[PDB]
């Protein structure tokens, strides 16, 4: 491939990044922000300023990788450092995380990365026999509540009930603990939401006019002290509920305190936060797929469970081809966590489709994942949600290009990489969600809106089996 100069520039000091920030949040929105520049520069690799800049991030300047050939450099731990960049060009204060740098911020060259990731691997494996019954019990209650609400209001707000369900499910599945039986009661979603906002506000718009938002959430960090007591309520819940897992932490050589902050983060930030985005997005995209697709999913799921003597098991799920494909297609079409960063460890030659680009050691690389996973040079019908995309031998080959977990779907998370520790769990629970919907309902209708973190979604009809 020809070597090209990386196009783009950072504009004038102070004003360049602020203008780009306005485009990103207000005047274009993230997708058009990136696509307009792809068009202008005639390149899927270019220089751009990223939020938050201002007084929160020291350096907003990145090289953006916006195709499925260049993007995977972000996974290669020999090419990129993955230290302190979970949230990009700033890192939330460790005052928000008990004074610890939590697992997600650690590079694999840090020895505690291996210990803590092994801890989470153990958490997930030890949960294996609780996942199915706890999912089926908690989500059954959710759909009961949604039917109730639809009968009262003629629509049912999915997010407003499902956030509690997700936390109850995780507490029961991971820790054999019902939050209702603890001091947390039903308060966890509100607590976690506030704490997550204190972490992520520099990257979010919450609807308000730019005259309010810019000085209030985009210029300076919100003070961690204001969420400390909320965080302590969550901490005490995890300390008291995670007994069995804390024994394993002890064996792995991790302090009780460090283990507990990491369990809190993995459960609340990574898992519950990820589900908070994913599940409403699934309801939206599957809703939009239409009633014929719903009918085909119901037919498949019910027939398979019938063939399995009414017992839902891992092997039964493997028979549900359209179901597996639909879940993969949600993750391809709308990756829940869209921003991945890595800092070049050494000089690199990054290949795109039609040119290669040279980056110097120390440059911040950035990828907006949906542009890599909706890359029309990789996927046919790239901007179409195609339920059956991954069905069969040929379809399954394309899973190497589904990147939601910060690595190819065909690859396994390890202590040596920064791929999502919960990769298999997420795909499992996403499948369980679709299964629970269509074992109960023939089809459904939705109404949709925006949310600071993903979509807002109402059911307007739920057609019972
Ligand atoms: C839908 C839910 C989830 C989504 C969308 C998601 C997505 C991601 C992504 C995109 C990353 C890469 C972060 C980066 O370096 O930029 C990541 C990392 C990580 N995730 Fe997940 N995740 C989810 C659920 C979970 C679960 C269930 C666990 C439980 C173990 C988990 C634990 C982790 C950990 C520990 C890392 C950092 C890995 C490391 O340091 O090697 N996540 N996740």
Swiss-Prot record:
What results from changing residue 270 to Q? Abolished allene oxide synthase activity
Superkingdom field: Eukaryota
Alphabetically ordered keywords of this record: Chloroplast, Fatty acid biosynthesis, Fatty acid metabolism, Heme, Iron, Lipid biosynthesis, Lipid metabolism, Lyase, Metal-binding, Oxylipin biosynthesis, Plastid, Transit peptide
Q: Where does heme b bind?
A: 82, 113, 117, 418, 420
Under which EC number(s) is this enzyme classified? 4.2.1.92
Binding positions for (13S)-hydroperoxy-(9Z,11E,15Z)-octadecatrienoate per the UniProt entry: 270, 338
Required cofactor names: heme b
Transmembrane residues, as ranges?
Answer: none
Q: Name one GO biological process term.
A: jasmonic acid biosynthetic process
For the ligand ((13S)-hydroperoxy-(9Z,11E)-octadecadienoate), the binding residues are 270, 338
Relate the induction remark in this record: By wounding.
Pathway named in the protein's UniProt entry:
Lipid metabolism; oxylipin biosynthesis
Q: What does this protein do?
A: Cytochrome P450 enzyme involved in the biosynthesis of oxylipin jasmonates, important phytohormones acting as growth regulators and signaling molecules for plant defense. Functions as an allene oxide synthase that converts hydroperoxy fatty acids to unstable allene epoxides. Catalyzes the dehydration of 13-HPOTE ((13S)-hydroperoxy-(9Z,11E,15Z)-octadecatrienoate), as well as 13-HPODE ((13S)-hydroperoxy-(9Z,11E)-octadecadienoate).
**Protein name, per record:** Allene oxide synthase, chloroplastic
Q: Which organism is it from?
A: Arabidopsis thaliana
